[PDB]
Amino acid sequence: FSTGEVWVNCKFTDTDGSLLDDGTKLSDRSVYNLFGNMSLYCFFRLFHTLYSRLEEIKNLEQ
Protein backbone atom coordinates (compact mmCIF):
# COMPACT_ATOMS: atom_id res chain seq x y z
CA PHE A 1 0.00 0.00 0.00
CA SER A 2 3.01 2.26 0.61
CA THR A 3 5.68 0.77 -1.68
CA GLY A 4 4.25 1.23 -5.19
CA GLU A 5 1.83 4.11 -4.77
CA VAL A 6 2.22 6.63 -7.62
CA TRP A 7 3.43 10.06 -6.73
CA VAL A 8 2.34 11.82 -9.90
CA ASN A 9 0.08 12.07 -12.66
CA CYS A 10 1.88 15.11 -14.10
CA LYS A 11 2.30 16.71 -17.51
CA PHE A 12 5.55 15.92 -19.32
CA THR A 13 6.52 18.04 -22.33
CA ASP A 14 8.44 16.49 -25.22
CA THR A 15 10.93 18.34 -27.43
CA ASP A 16 8.01 20.24 -28.96
CA GLY A 17 6.11 20.04 -25.66
CA SER A 18 3.50 17.32 -26.16
CA LEU A 19 1.90 15.68 -23.13
CA LEU A 20 3.44 12.21 -22.87
CA ASP A 21 2.64 9.06 -20.89
CA ASP A 22 2.59 9.37 -17.09
CA GLY A 23 2.73 5.63 -16.84
CA THR A 24 -1.04 5.94 -17.27
CA LYS A 25 -1.34 4.97 -20.95
CA LEU A 26 -2.46 1.33 -21.14
CA SER A 27 -0.76 0.11 -24.30
CA ASP A 28 -1.77 -3.09 -26.07
CA ARG A 29 0.86 -5.66 -25.08
CA SER A 30 1.51 -9.19 -26.30
CA VAL A 31 4.94 -9.93 -24.76
CA TYR A 32 4.29 -10.96 -21.17
CA ASN A 33 6.91 -11.30 -18.45
CA LEU A 34 7.44 -13.35 -15.31
CA PHE A 35 9.96 -13.33 -12.46
CA GLY A 36 11.33 -16.03 -10.21
CA ASN A 37 14.22 -17.51 -8.29
CA MET A 38 16.77 -20.05 -9.52
CA SER A 39 14.42 -22.99 -8.93
CA LEU A 40 11.96 -21.94 -11.61
CA TYR A 41 14.91 -21.09 -13.86
CA CYS A 42 16.24 -24.64 -13.60
CA PHE A 43 12.75 -26.04 -14.11
CA PHE A 44 12.48 -23.99 -17.30
CA ARG A 45 15.90 -25.12 -18.52
CA LEU A 46 15.20 -28.82 -18.07
CA PHE A 47 11.80 -28.31 -19.66
CA HIS A 48 13.29 -26.77 -22.77
CA THR A 49 15.80 -29.61 -22.94
CA LEU A 50 13.04 -32.22 -22.97
CA TYR A 51 11.06 -30.19 -25.50
CA SER A 52 13.99 -29.83 -27.89
CA ARG A 53 14.76 -33.54 -27.81
CA LEU A 54 11.19 -34.60 -28.55
CA GLU A 55 11.13 -31.97 -31.29
CA GLU A 56 14.13 -33.57 -32.97
CA ILE A 57 12.34 -36.92 -32.77
CA LYS A 58 9.27 -35.45 -34.44
CA ASN A 59 11.45 -33.94 -37.15
CA LEU A 60 12.93 -37.38 -37.89
CA GLU A 61 9.52 -39.12 -37.92
CA GLN A 62 9.27 -38.89 -41.71
Partner: protein
Protein backbone atom coordinates in the same frame (compact mmCIF):
# COMPACT_ATOMS: atom_id res chain seq x y z
CA UNK B 1 1.77 -15.24 -3.91
CA UNK B 2 4.14 -14.55 -6.80
CA UNK B 3 1.99 -16.81 -8.96
CA UNK B 4 -1.07 -14.91 -7.74
CA UNK B 5 0.55 -11.69 -8.92
CA UNK B 6 1.49 -13.22 -12.26
CA UNK B 7 -2.06 -14.43 -12.81
CA UNK B 8 -3.21 -10.92 -11.99
CA UNK B 9 -0.91 -9.40 -14.60
CA UNK B 10 -1.33 -12.12 -17.20
CA UNK B 11 -4.99 -12.18 -18.27
CA UNK B 12 -4.72 -8.40 -18.53
CA UNK B 13 -3.75 -8.24 -22.20
CA UNK B 14 -3.02 -4.54 -21.60
CA UNK B 15 -1.15 -2.99 -18.69
CA UNK B 16 0.62 0.33 -18.26
CA UNK B 17 4.29 0.53 -17.25
CA UNK B 18 3.23 1.52 -13.73
CA UNK B 19 1.20 -1.61 -12.99
CA UNK B 20 3.99 -3.91 -14.19
CA UNK B 21 6.41 -1.95 -12.02
CA UNK B 22 4.16 -2.39 -8.98
CA UNK B 23 3.98 -6.09 -9.84
CA UNK B 24 7.78 -6.18 -9.91
CA UNK B 25 8.21 -4.41 -6.58
CA UNK B 26 5.46 -6.49 -4.97
CA UNK B 27 7.21 -9.66 -6.10
CA UNK B 28 10.63 -8.48 -4.94
CA UNK B 29 9.22 -7.50 -1.54
CA UNK B 30 7.58 -10.91 -1.27
CA UNK B 31 10.99 -12.40 -2.07
CA UNK B 32 13.69 -10.41 -0.30
CA UNK B 33 17.09 -8.94 -1.17
CA UNK B 34 19.48 -11.91 -1.18
CA UNK B 35 17.66 -14.17 -3.67
CA UNK B 36 18.91 -13.67 -7.22
CA UNK B 37 16.08 -12.69 -9.56
CA UNK B 38 15.60 -14.04 -13.06
CA UNK B 39 12.93 -13.13 -15.58
CA UNK B 40 11.28 -15.04 -18.41
CA UNK B 41 9.46 -13.26 -21.22
CA UNK B 42 6.91 -15.10 -23.35
CA UNK B 43 6.17 -13.60 -26.76
CA UNK B 44 3.09 -15.45 -27.97
CA UNK B 45 3.14 -13.33 -31.14
CA UNK B 46 6.47 -14.76 -32.28
CA UNK B 47 6.17 -17.61 -29.75
CA UNK B 48 9.61 -17.09 -28.23
CA UNK B 49 10.71 -17.32 -24.61
CA UNK B 50 13.72 -15.43 -23.29
CA UNK B 51 15.56 -15.91 -20.00
CA UNK B 52 17.31 -12.89 -18.49
CA UNK B 53 19.03 -12.61 -15.12
CA UNK B 54 17.60 -9.42 -13.61
CA UNK B 55 19.96 -7.78 -11.14
CA UNK B 56 19.72 -4.64 -9.05
CA UNK B 57 20.72 -2.55 -12.10
CA UNK B 58 18.50 -4.24 -14.72
CA UNK B 59 15.51 -2.29 -16.05
CA UNK B 60 12.03 -3.77 -16.29
CA UNK B 61 11.17 -3.36 -19.98
CA UNK B 62 14.07 -3.44 -22.41
CA UNK B 63 12.40 -3.70 -25.82
CA UNK B 64 11.68 0.02 -26.25
CA UNK B 65 12.67 1.35 -29.66
CA UNK B 66 12.19 5.14 -29.93
CA UNK B 67 13.94 7.84 -27.91
CA UNK B 68 10.61 9.55 -27.18
CA UNK B 69 9.05 6.14 -26.66
CA UNK B 70 12.08 5.66 -24.46
CA UNK B 71 11.06 8.97 -22.83
CA UNK B 72 7.62 7.60 -21.95
CA UNK B 73 8.39 3.98 -21.15
CA UNK B 74 11.48 4.23 -19.03
CA UNK B 75 10.26 7.49 -17.67
CA UNK B 76 7.48 5.39 -16.21
CA UNK B 77 9.69 3.07 -14.16
CA UNK B 78 10.83 5.66 -11.65
CA UNK B 79 7.34 6.05 -10.15
CA UNK B 80 7.57 3.39 -7.45
CA UNK B 81 7.80 4.78 -3.95
CA UNK B 82 10.79 2.45 -3.71
CA UNK B 83 14.14 3.85 -4.94
CA UNK B 84 15.31 3.76 -8.54
CA UNK B 85 15.88 0.93 -10.98
CA UNK B 86 19.20 0.71 -12.80
CA UNK B 87 20.95 3.15 -10.44
CA UNK B 88 22.55 2.12 -7.17
CA UNK B 89 22.07 4.47 -4.13
Amino acid sequence: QVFMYYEKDRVQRRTSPRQQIMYRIQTETAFGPDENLCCIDWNSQTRQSAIRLMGREDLTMGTLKSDAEKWCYYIGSYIMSSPTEGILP
